[PDB]
Amino acid sequence: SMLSPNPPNLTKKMKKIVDAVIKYKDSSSGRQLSEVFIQLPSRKELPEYYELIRKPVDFKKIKERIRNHKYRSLNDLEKDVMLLCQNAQTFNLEGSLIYEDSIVLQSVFTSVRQKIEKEDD
């Protein structure tokens, strides 16, 4: 809540981590793996997703939760990113493009978080 903000360095690290996850591009393919995950379609647009996924989330919402200080730790942020990817893996088949992209984005998050959490070490 804005009534009691996070320390500014935490907000800054959250933003740096999510920005790097969103910008990640495979070199061999050129594709920004996050693009399909920025905004989930609405219930009227993709009702099958909401029948299968109990807790929908997208990167648009994750960015809002950084800016509103809803996440109180990098762990809080990580839980939502991993929820997004697990949701993608539940709605899509193993080996499909969107499933596999979400697997890589999990690893990108873990790698980026390690670098940024320790950048003052």
Ligand X SMILES: Nc1nnc(-c2ccccc2O)cc1N1CC[NH2+]CC1
| Nearest-angstrom CA–CA distance, 106 and 86 | 9
Q: What is the separation, in whole angstroms, between the first and last Cα of the chain?
A: 29
Residue 59, token pair as written in the block: 């990167």
Shortest Cβ distance from residue 68 to ligand X (Å)?
19
Please name the residues in contact with 71: beta carbons below 8 A apart, sequence gap of 6 or more.
Answer: 6, 14, 65, 77, 80
CB closest to ligand X, residue no:
88
- For ligand X, the closer CB: 55 or 118: 55
- For ligand X, the closer CB: 5 or 41: 41
* Interacting residues with ligand X (CB under 6 A): 36-37, 40-41, 46, 58, 84, 87-88, 91-92, 98
Shortest Cβ distance from residue 72 to ligand X (Å)?
23
